[PDB]
Amino acid sequence: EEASSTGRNFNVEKINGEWHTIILASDKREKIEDNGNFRLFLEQIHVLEKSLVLKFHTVRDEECSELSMVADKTEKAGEYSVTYDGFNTFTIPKTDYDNFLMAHLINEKDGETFQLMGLYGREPDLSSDIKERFAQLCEEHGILRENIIDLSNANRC
Ligand SMILES: CCCCCCCCCCO
């Protein structure tokens, strides 16, 4: 079965555990390019009562660096917020819990904004069919495929 974090049947406990960044997308491409602050490689999600603890690593000059973030539930069900290079809010528009998770995030910094979308997998890669479904979700948010970056061949340290 599939669910959205904003949906009535969402079961947040089921997204707990191991995840990997498979594809990142943004309407401001530089944010997810080589030295972008949003080129984050997810490692795990720890589900807590009113928050999610996210563990990631970033890469630079071929060197991995760990970083953790705590995302808090907001007043709208299925939405979380976290401070990181500005103020962010995000939801999970589609996940099947066992294979993939698609997240949509809005960043606000210095009076500006941009959208980020991420495709995460339980394994270090996903099927071409799931990757195509992600491209379609990106299209629905006005993000061109040329702004979608597959990082499956570079998500391990
Ligand atoms: C539901 C947990 C998935 C992570 C939320 C998206 C955060 C994007 C990090 C910058 O690429």
From Swiss-Prot:
Briefly state the protein's biological role: Binds pheromones that are released from drying urine of males. These pheromones affect the sexual behavior of females.
Q: Which domain of life does the protein's organism represent? A: Eukaryota
Q: Cross-referenced SUPFAM superfamilies, in alphabetical order? A: Lipocalins
What's a GO biological-process term for it? cellular response to lipid
Q: Which gene encodes it?
A: Mup2
Q: Name one GO cellular component term.
A: cytosol
Matching InterPro entries? Calycin, Lipocalin, Lipocalin_CS, Lipocln_cytosolic_FA-bd_dom, Maj_urinary
PANTHER family with a match to the protein in the record: LIPOCALIN (PTHR11430), MAJOR URINARY PROTEIN 1-RELATED (PTHR11430:SF76)
What are the protein's UniProt keywords?
A: Disulfide bond, Pheromone-binding, Secreted, Signal, Transport
Tissue note: Abundant in the urine of adult male mice but absent from that of females.
MF terms in GO: insulin receptor activity; pheromone binding; small molecule binding
Does the keyword Hydrolase belong to this entry?
no
Keyword Membrane on entry: no
Q: Which cysteines are joined by disulfide bonds?
A: C64-C157
| Annotated protein name in UniProt | Major urinary protein 2
* First-listed, main subcellular location of the protein, grouped into a coarse class: secreted
Q: Which family does it belong to?
A: Belongs to the calycin superfamily. Lipocalin family.
Which locations, inside or outside the cell, does it occupy?
Answer: Secreted
